């Protein structure tokens with residue numbers, strides 16, 4: 205009865221998350237700096253790093269290595285560092301453990317006293333022992349709502365609430381995001397060591413209050429409307445489709461802390477709101493390959509969003525119809541964006557949080 | 561890879577098909593609970609770590625974990641963190657594990673609000689947890705699985721279990737692989753345990769007479785596989801390729817790394833028992849006379865634990881419908897054969913308590 209989003213498409217996420225990787229690049233610098241200065245546990249207790257919202261692990265390798273390299277300048281080489289990667293139960297943890305074993309960039313291949321574990325429990329509850337996490341990292345994860353809000357109006361003509369014209373829906377999604385953010389902070393506040401640091405990167409609204417990805421969202425909705433026109437999609441199924449993602453404004457991120465600056469033992473040490481460089485547009489300006497441009501954007505949308513859309517179908521998620529739906533939708537979005545390539549806004553927020 | 565490994569349990573059926581395992585491990589829970597009463601615990605703010613080596617779906621971990629946690633709660637504050645680290649191979653179904661921990665009312669997460677869960681998908685034949693952090697280790701029905709089919713070992717012609725093979729070279733190769741695997745397992749647990757820590761192991765053993773047990777089951781399985789070849793459902797080449805990388809150890813094998821002075825890599829055997837588990841399927845049949853249920857229980861047990869490893873030998877994919885049909889038919893065949901002539905079976909086990917030097 206509680207409707208939740210779907211995890212990333214395991215088969216394609218590691219190959220289709222270059223946008224996310226490029227966008228989080230500035231946050232790695234913050235994370236590295238946090239690792240250089242954070243108070244550490246008494247030797248020889250293991251130093252714990254937490255990665256909240258790991259998916260396949262591909263985009264975690266660089267931030268984890270940056271922290272580990274920084275820590276190694278401060279501690280003995282034989283001292284244990286434990287990385288706890290967290291996601292939802294239905295995330296593909298086999299893909300994660302294969303990434304950690306097989307990818308040359310894996311920290312396990314670079315540091316002989318580093319260790320890996322996984323936690324498959326929603327990060328909107330406490331999932332690690334209190335006072336044990338020295339360094340927390342979360343990129344591209346917290347924009348995902350814990351649920352479609354209870355009693356929220358069905359998004360009749362849209363898949364993203366920011367583009368919806370239903371005021372009741374907007375408020376319901378906004379309240380859910382506010383409660384989710386409070387919950388996330390409350391439990392990270394318990395998990396962090398005193399003096400510990402948490403670096404968060406999430407989807408944001410820009411200075412004008414816009415969600416961004418405008419041509420993408422237009423292409424997506426149009427491609428879905430074409431499937432109902434061609435009889436590939438039922439009108440009821442399209443009505444049910446919704447992405448439980450909310451992008452937060454600066455004011456939304458600060459809300460739990462106002463006005464004294466603290467919430468559940470945590471404070472905002474640094475906050476930045478910025479637009480990530482549009483690499484797909486930059487590449488297109490260089491090579492003029494419109495088909496490639498369309499394929500890059502469509503692949504990004506597929507791995508991250510399509511499993512959630514496919515969950516609304518009358519058939520099963522393992523049903524061949526769902527696979528056909530995913531592949532057709534990707535090809536249609538690709539064609540639409542390839543026909544008229546345009547730059548897009550990728551609004552992000554980075555935060556450094558510190559525990560008392 | 562040219563290194564051939566066993567396959568994990570069938571996650572779809574293991575939680576429903578592991579009552580034999582659950583019943584067999586029951587005596588080891590008592591040992592584990594007793595260990596929990598006195599093992600040293602780590603300095604604050606470190607959680608007490610309980611490691612579960614070879615978790616599968618988690619179904620059979622709930623009882624031993626809760627026994628340890630209950631004992632620990634008689635010693636320490638209710639708000640002290642306890643972390644259970646469940647370990648398996650990368651291709652284990654960890655989603656099934658986390659669903660078990662969230663949904664089963666027997667889950668320690670539902671009974672202890674300061675208990676936590678994690679998973680480690682890295683072979684336990686290497687070190688997979690930080691040195692000196694584990695107070696209590698548990699491993700049931702896992703260490704009999706070889707790290708690999710031994711390199712250069714002859715194809716198990718006419719057999720799927722090496723104990724029943726007539727090939728001397730195959731038997732020796734499997735025995736040597738088991739011996740080095742056991743040394744590896746001990747070496748790395750010896751590093752992971754806290755000084756004074758305890759590890760409880762339950763594994764498949766050879767009985768007093770050096771026998772593997774499950775004889776009627778073994779016979780039914782071989783006969784059923786032969787039926788599939790004869791009926792054109794399985795290629796002769798595929799059956800030749802099939803081998804279960806499982807080795808049951810005698811007392812002497814278990815003691816081998818420790819002999820003669822009693823210690824290996826900081827560990828010693830505190831207690832060792834070798835016993836046959838009560839055959840509950842036979843007991844039920846003696847009570848109710850339901851031969852069909854008898855066959856189904858045995859075949860379900862074999863299916864969940866063994867059939868993925870057999871299916872890996874097929875020329876098709878493991879995700880192919882042909883592999884599913886193979887598993888389903890093999891189960892039905894074994895069930896029918898055992899139902900036709902119900903017989904008691906030997907289930908030889910060994911339980912060990914290992915202690916790390918203080």
Ligand SMILES: Nc1ncnc2c1ncn2[C@@H]1O[C@H](CSCC[C@H](N)C(=O)O)[C@@H](O)[C@H]1O
Pocket residue numbers: 210211212221224225228256257258259260263264290291292295325326327328342343344345346348349350
């Ligand atoms: N409540 C929740 N608890 C844990 N993980 C969640 C979650 N809601 C969403 N996620 C996870 O957040 C991930 C978003 S993809 C981000 C992956 C990676 N950090 C990167 O930067 O590319 C998905 O794996 C999704 O399953």
Ligand SMILES: Nc1ncnc2c1ncn2[C@@H]1O[C@H](CSCC[C@H](N)C(=O)O)[C@@H](O)[C@H]1O
Pocket residue numbers: 567568569578581582585613614615616617620621647648649652682683684685699700701702703705706707
């Ligand atoms: N090298 C290895 N490392 C980790 N796990 C292994 C392994 N070899 C086999 N296993 C695991 O051991 C498990 C055996 S099933 C036993 C499950 C449970 N402990 C019970 O008592 O019922 C399987 O999940 C299998 O994947």
Ligand SMILES: CCCCCCCC(=O)O
Pocket residue numbers: 224344345364417420421449508509
């Ligand atoms: C138009 C919305 C785009 C959402 C991107 C989500 C990225 C991720 O979760 O990895």
Ligand SMILES: CCCCCCCC(=O)O
Pocket residue numbers: 581701702774777778806865866
């Ligand atoms: C006849 C061989 C029986 C092997 C049982 C393996 C049980 C398990 O690994 O869970």
